[PDB]
Design a protein around this ligand. Structure first.
Ligand SMILES: O=C1CCc2cc(N3CC[C@](O)(C(=O)NCc4cc(F)cc(Cl)c4)C3=O)ccc2N1
Ligand SMILES: [Mn+2]
Ligand SMILES: [Mn+2]
Length: 365
């Protein structure tokens, strides 16, 4: 049985090594109208699904850890806490439930806790005194993995009911994206459907009215092994690419709603970094730079990391070494992504498996 607060690894809760499936859906019908039900009973589709069973089992173990962490977070996240306090309490729980073991199991990327106008990629660095406020809109976005099978799942936290319709708009747009997704579906069609649903909402916040805008330069994405962004884009506005989703792919279906411009730009101090997946072996003689790259290669590989995690590993005076890795193109910085000052942004996200037999919303219980 899981403790209160959670501390027992998901691995210990399932002695047989079989982790719970997420929500399973039949794929959407074709434009002509023929159903995709045939996939469930097809012997060919079953064998193929069975061929990838260990992979789905890893995503499910990571998803069960993600669900237990987020239910724990919802129970205590309150204004007055520092953003550092929130991230450390969440990560401590995630490390325990995932049974962190180097590159074999762990945290897939830093805990985003972006506030208000900032939509993504904010996590505090050491010394950040930011405190969560009653009127804040906080996007908790964190990831877990087993053998690099990543669960990318996020939700928005508020305390003031004035944002309730804004959150409902974004939740409905995310559920629309999940519903529209499937093998052979055009990525632009998903984007147009998401936008249609999000833009049907009007909200009133402190006497000002807004039509909920999707953040046009943010999007959902394909997921690869140890690769958070695998190359395919799931837009959240019309005008996108008519490229299609394929069998066996994994996607993060995420949407962002804004009362601002519906466009984000890099802002604030950078906390998130990640090795460029396409960069091969680069010999480094510069000793501090060489050491930091070895620390990154050992602890994170191609998974995203943050400055707090380098501090936790006992690294110090590494900022110039980190800038060098960025200048060399080995590491890429991912600074906070913000809409205009005074705007409010919300996000909801789930991970889906485009299995040969069905569509599994693996991060949804
Ligand atoms: O064109 C773009 C550029 C910005 C962008 C951002 C995103 N977001 C926003 C939050 C997100 O869900 C997440 O959890 N990110 C963790 C993460 C940490 C890193 F250090 C590096 C990377 Cl790649 C990802 C995600 O994927 C999604 C699409 C786009 N499209
Ligand atoms: Mn995310
Ligand atoms: Mn994502």
């Amino acid at each position: 049985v899981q403790t209160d607060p959670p501390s027992v690894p998901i691995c210990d809760l399932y002695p047989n090594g079989v982790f719970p499936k997420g929500q399973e859906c039949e794929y959407p019908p074709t434009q002509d109208g023929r159903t995709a039900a045939w996939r469930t009973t097809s012997e060919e589709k079953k064998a193929l699904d069975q061929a990838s069973e260990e992979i789905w089992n890893d995503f499910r173990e990571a998803a069960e850890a993600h669900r237990q962490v987020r239910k724990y977070v919802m129970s205590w996240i309150k204004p007055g806490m520092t953003m550092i306090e929130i991230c450390e309490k969440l990560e401590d729980c995630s490390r325990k439930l995932i049974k962190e073991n180097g590159l074999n199991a762990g945290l897939a990327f830093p805990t985003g806790c972006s506030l208000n106008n900032c939509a993504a990629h904010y996590t505090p660095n050491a010394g950040d005194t930011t405190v969560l406020q009653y009127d804040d809109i906080c996007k908790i976005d964190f990831g877990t993995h087993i053998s690099g099978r990543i669960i990318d799942c996020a939700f928005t936290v508020t305390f003031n009911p004035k944002y309730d319709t804004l959150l409902k708009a974004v939740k409905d747009a995310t559920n629309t994206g999940i519903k529209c997704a499937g093998i052979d579906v055009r990525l632009c069609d998903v984007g147009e459907a998401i936008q249609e649903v999000m833009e049907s909402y009007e909200v009133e916040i402190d006497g000002k009215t807004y039509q909920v805008k999707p953040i046009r330069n943010l999007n959902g994405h394909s997921i690869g092994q140890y690769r958070i962004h695998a190359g395919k884009t799931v837009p959240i506005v019309k005008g996108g690419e008519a490229t299609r989703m394929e069998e066996g792919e994994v996607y993060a279906i995420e949407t962002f709603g804004s009362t601002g411009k519906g466009v984000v730009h890099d802002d604030m101090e950078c906390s998130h970094y990640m090795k460029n997946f396409d960069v091969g072996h680069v010999p480094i003689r510069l000793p501090r730079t060489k050491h930091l790259l070895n620390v990154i290669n050992e602890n994170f590989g191609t998974l995203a990391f943050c400055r707090r995690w380098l501090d936790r590993l006992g690294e110090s005076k590494y900022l110039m070494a980190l800038k060098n890795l960025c200048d060399l193109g080995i590491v890429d910085p991912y600074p906070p992504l913000c809409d205009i000052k005074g705007s409010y942004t919300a996000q909801f996200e789930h991970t889906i498996l485009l299995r040969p037999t069905c569509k599994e919303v693996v991060s949804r219980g």
